[PDB]
Amino acid sequence: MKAMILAAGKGERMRPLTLHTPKPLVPVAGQPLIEYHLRALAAAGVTEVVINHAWLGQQIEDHLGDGSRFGLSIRYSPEGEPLETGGGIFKALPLLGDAPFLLVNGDVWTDYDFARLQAPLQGLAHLVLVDNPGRGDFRLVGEQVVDGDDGTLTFSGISVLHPALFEGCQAGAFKLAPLLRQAMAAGKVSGEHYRGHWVDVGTLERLAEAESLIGE
């Protein structure tokens, strides 16, 4: 299937790095964060990728271009207003079309093997969950994801989404989580618990951890 990489974040918590460099282009062990995803996606057999952007967006396009160096075809979804994760995905849906797509949070660094998500999957959404880095986000019972409360897990920012998840939505800014929680209540969200390496690189301290973990 196709993949979307979320890359529109302003990365205020990573200043001053993100003053002239958008977060997805920040180097982790010599390589831009987002290029780990592109190489892994290409290795997993993905050939078409959509990348949304806002803050310093044109630098992302200039650096990556059409993606041919990665064996990929990249299309961009520019945002001129903050749309959040849900609104950003919605704006990009015409580029993704009607079929389920892989969704990856650009800020994440992870070992996770994207080719795993090509296996037969469950629901309007299939979420990869990780140990809390914390009250967590969600709970996993067997393969079914439910809302968190008391052994909770954290959403990794890695998932497969069905465009139908967004049926009825209106253009504009809105968050993804509330939509997932609405699908969970309908029993349409499956998931899995990944126990390997995963870091949400939102701060210089997270950058370091990723650096350290990549040292193995």
Cβ at position 130, least distance to ligand 491 in Å: 8
| Residue 202 found at the interface with ligand 491 (CB under 6 A) | yes
Q: Which residue in 90, 155, 174, 194 binds ligand 491 (CB under 6 A)?
A: 155
Nearest residue to 154 (alpha-carbon basis) of 114, 111, 188, 108: 108
Residue in 1, 121, 173, 177 binding ligand 491, rule: CB under 6 A: 177
What six digits make up the tokens of 133?
């880095």
C-alpha distance from residue 71 to each of 14, 77, 158, 216 (Å): 30, 20, 21, 26
Three-class SS state of 143: coil
Residue 62 or 150 with smaller CB distance to ligand 491? 150
Could you give the 3-state DSSP secondary structure of residue 94? helix
DSSP state of 164: G
Q: Does residue number 117 form part of the binding site for ligand 491 (CB under 6 A)?
A: no
Q: Which of 123, 157, 160, 194 binds ligand 491 (CB under 6 A)?
A: 157
Positions that interact with ligand 491 (CB under 6 A): 85, 105, 107, 137, 154-155, 157, 176-177, 200, 202
